[PDB]
Design a protein around this ligand. Sequence first.
Ligand SMILES: N=C(N)N1CCCCC1
Lengths: 10, 247
Amino acid sequence: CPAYSXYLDC
Amino acid sequence: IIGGEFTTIENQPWFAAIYRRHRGGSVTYVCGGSLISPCWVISATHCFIDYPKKEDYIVYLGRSRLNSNTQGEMKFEVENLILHKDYSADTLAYHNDIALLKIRSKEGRCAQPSRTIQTIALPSMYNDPQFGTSCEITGFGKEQSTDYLYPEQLKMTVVKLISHRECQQPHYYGSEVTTKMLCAADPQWKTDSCQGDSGGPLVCSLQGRMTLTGIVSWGRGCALKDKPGVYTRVSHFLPWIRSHTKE
Ligand SMILES: N=C(N)N1CCCCC1
């Protein structure tokens, strides 16, 4: 999954 | 802004729209900011940390639209771009995500207040509204997480402050949130800040005075259940702000 600000959950 | 409503700059006249000029001359939107005095705009360090050179930036005040001029607007160069030396980030959470832009027009002037251009008060130290208080957020960020384009017209919405206790729960953000950040979200998760809103104001009315309580910083997704927006908690940075602006 991980994991960025802002975009999608995954 | 996911959800919310369209607006114009008269309803957020401290809002600053910050753009970057590219090597070959195109200009793209970066982030929002807030006018805290005529010569100073406050924003978030993550918005500038890849391109830290002040000559790269243009700041507008009194602008309602992303890619056209609003009558009355003012355009400024950035005389000093001040990033917080304790900035850190891991793919998600930014810490000390706060920046100051000293602005100066090509005529060597700072902002001149008008119907479309005004400053926003800073909070007293360590003085924030109660959790559950409704506050407002403003920006030209995405209207949907999957959108490719930013809206052409400025937007605002209303989110409620969430306690550090609620936000620190592992099904929210765990240890990613610190007491120098504030969480805020909608109760239905249907409205939120999103990509391109960073740097902009979270404004709360603290006994009649509109106050810059927060600066949009980060979040997982946009308007995603159990994942609030996270804001720099301005009332914990007053000494930093006073020193760097007195400058
Ligand atoms: N409020 C959230 N969810 N954000 C704000 C900052 C950029 C992306 C996501």
